[PDB]
Amino acid sequence: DPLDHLADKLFHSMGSDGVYARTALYESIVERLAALITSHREAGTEALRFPPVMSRAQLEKSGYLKSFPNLLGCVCGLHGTEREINAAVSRFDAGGDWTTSLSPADLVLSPAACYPVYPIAASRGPLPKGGLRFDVAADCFRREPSKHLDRLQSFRMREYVCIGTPDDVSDFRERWMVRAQAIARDLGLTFRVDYASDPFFGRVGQMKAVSQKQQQLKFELLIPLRSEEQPTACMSFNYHREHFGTTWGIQDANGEPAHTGCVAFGMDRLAVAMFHTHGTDLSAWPAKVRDILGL
């Protein structure tokens, strides 16, 4: 795989595919990318930072299980009595399976950064004119083990989320699709923006995808990393219509169920794209890119 050679400078093995320790070099560029993204934040945008876990009930309510049940990481633990826990530990001591004593917590690992923002927004009553905009980030988890450096199980996601009327959200997404491309250009990256779909689970799911593609609810900024034939989505631009507005009872300024949309930046994918494109020697990166990043 074309990205494999980057591993030695960027990552250390943590004994699990898609889960890596990040070197100082790698983290310095993720940090500069995050700072660059922040510098493009629209005025009036509320910034929230989420932990890597969120309420299981909130995620269930958002409908994640109808779409990607196969990707979800649930938090489980030994919730029993002292005696039961001791047996589990004793089983482990004997080289057995202590994990049979696990039961689900009321938490999951967040599969995307925006999910927790919807109930937060909803708790504030009806939307002002022009809607609400949020800047959110979380370390996310998707259960998709792979050896490829652009397909991680644990990865950073940064998002700008818009909640409002259809026009508010559509205008928002159009601004960000142009703006994202300008950022990618400034970063010296090769890319194209194309129609896309989420990888919905099951037979029905793949037909949900076709319909999604047909309605142009999702665009991706695609960067050739292993090949030009199979480029990597490093950003997405998502229109959810009224799904979350209805789910969480968010009402726009006109009394109608809010529309929502988000622009998502895959921070690790962007960092890997930078190193693939420009190499691991920062002093040799192009002057304009070094400048854009404040190096």
Binding site: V204, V210, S211, Q212, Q214
Partner: peptide
Amino acid sequence: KLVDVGLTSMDMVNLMLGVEITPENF
């Protein structure tokens, strides 16, 4: 075309259940 009629997803789902699956033959 086929999606401009007003057929959204939940509407396209029933069309799957009425009658490999690529964004071309539909």
